Amino acid sequence: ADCGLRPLFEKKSLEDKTERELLESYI
Amino acid sequence: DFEEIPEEYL
Amino acid sequence: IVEGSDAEIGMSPWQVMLFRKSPQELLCGASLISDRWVLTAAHCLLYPPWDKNFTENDLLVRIGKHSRTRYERNIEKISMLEKIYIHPRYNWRENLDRDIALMKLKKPVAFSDYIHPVCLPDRETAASLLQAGYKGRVTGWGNLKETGQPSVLQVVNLPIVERPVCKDSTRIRITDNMFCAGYKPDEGKRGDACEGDSGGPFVMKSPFNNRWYQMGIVSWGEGCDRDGKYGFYTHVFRLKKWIQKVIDQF
Ligand SMILES: CC(C)C[C@H](NS(=O)(=O)Cc1ccccc1)C(=O)N1CCC[C@H]1C(=O)NCCCCNC(=N)N
Ligand code: NA
Ligand code: NA
Numbered sequence: 001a002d003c004g005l006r007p008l009f010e011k012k013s014l015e016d017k018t019e020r021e022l023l024e025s026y027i
Numbered sequence: 028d029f030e031e032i033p034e035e036y037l
Numbered sequence: 038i039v040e041g042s043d044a045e046i047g048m049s050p051w052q053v054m055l056f057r058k059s060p061q062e063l064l065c066g067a068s069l070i071s072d073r074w075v076l077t078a079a080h081c082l083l084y085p086p087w088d089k090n091f092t093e094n095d096l097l098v099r100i101g102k103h104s105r106t107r108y109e110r111n112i113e114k115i116s117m118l119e120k121i122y123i124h125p126r127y128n129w130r131e132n133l134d135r136d137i138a139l140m141k142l143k144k145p146v147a148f149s150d151y152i153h154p155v156c157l158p159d160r161e162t163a164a165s166l167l168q169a170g171y172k173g174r175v176t177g178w179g180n181l182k183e184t185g186q187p188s189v190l191q192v193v194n195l196p197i198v199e200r201p202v203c204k205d206s207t208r209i210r211i212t213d214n215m216f217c218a219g220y221k222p223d224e225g226k227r228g229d230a231c232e233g234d235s236g237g238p239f240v241m242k243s244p245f246n247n248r249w250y251q252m253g254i255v256s257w258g259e260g261c262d263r264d265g266k267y268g269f270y271t272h273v274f275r276l277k278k279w280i281q282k283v284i285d286q287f
Contacts, residue, residue, distance in 0.1 A: 002153075003070075003153075003154050003155060003156035003157075003248065004154070004155050004156035004243075004248035004249040004250060005153070005247075005248060005249075006047060006048070006050055006153060006249070007047060007050065007148075007149070007150040007151075007153060008046065008047030008048075008050075008150050009047065009048070010247055010248075016045050016048050017045060018042075018174075018192075018194055019242055021172060021194050022171075022172045022173070022174065022194060022241065022242050023242070023244055025170060025171050025172040025196060026166070026171055026244045027168075027170075027171075
């Protein structure tokens with residue numbers, strides 16, 4: 001249920017330095 | 028190399 | 038991880054280190070998927086050509102780590118294994134087909150800012166994210182070079198590669214239980230998993246529900262970050278029924 005949501009990023013609405021690179025590849 | 032861990036853990 | 042970077046604190050809280058008791062050393066990477074279950078590559082625990090066949094008492098899992106060598110007091114948790122479960126059709130004789138294993142811990146680990154489980158994918162997550170070009174993220178404390186040792190956890194983002202390109206890059210027989218990822222020569226960019234990253238997670242962040250899903254397990258490769266070569270990963274979704282079956286029973 002809370003899997004895959006990171007306490008220091010998603011749960012605080014913070015982004016890590018390169019997750020947008022992943023997003024931009026999803027197409 | 029690896030620092031020792033508490034003997035608790037074996 | 039070759040040509041990656043230092044992970045940020047708490048960037049991969051499902052990251053697990055399989056640690057040999059004697060001699061005290063890095064054995065592999067691995068993943069936290071619940072408070073008592075850890076996922077890894079089968080070859081991390083069983084590989085007869087190298088006389089590797091670990092039992093529960095030979096190792097420990099260390100969770101919540103950042104530093105490779107240090108004991109991270111008040112941050113990491115060290116857990117003992119109750120039981121190991123290797124895929125009954127894991128092919129160590131030929132190509133590591135069905136390269137997957139589960140470990141049940143003796144006691145539940147407490148979740149924290151540094152310790153948290155990754156999701157496993159269902160059919161639609163796989164359908165939608167396992168696409169040539171889509172990038173995943175691999176992390177580990179393995180070698181920085183094919184021919185060294187990182188201070189902290191390393192991370193690298195890598196695109197999933199087209200099935201025929203994977204096939205044509207190697208003489209090994211590729212199965213539907215594997216996929217490959219990495220940049221092509223013409224893409225200039227680099228990166229790869231390497232020795233010691235074995236068993237670690239290849240993850241993707243769902244753009245639908247903003248959750249991280251482990252799509253792959255670091256399984257094998259020819260050298261590390263070679264031009265024209267690609268890292269190969271166990272296809273977690275393709276082996277999920279086994280995973281469900283093991284956890285449902287035990
Ligand atoms: C010594 C030999 C070159 C190692 C080996 N590669 S290999 O080129 O022989 C190809 C192979 C793969 C599986 C079974 C038999 C042969 C392989 O990667 N192995 C054989 C058994 C376990 C697996 C491995 O070491 N996994 C470590 C992760 C490597 C990740 N590499 C990477 N992404 N580039
Ligand atoms: Na080939
Ligand atoms: Na390469």
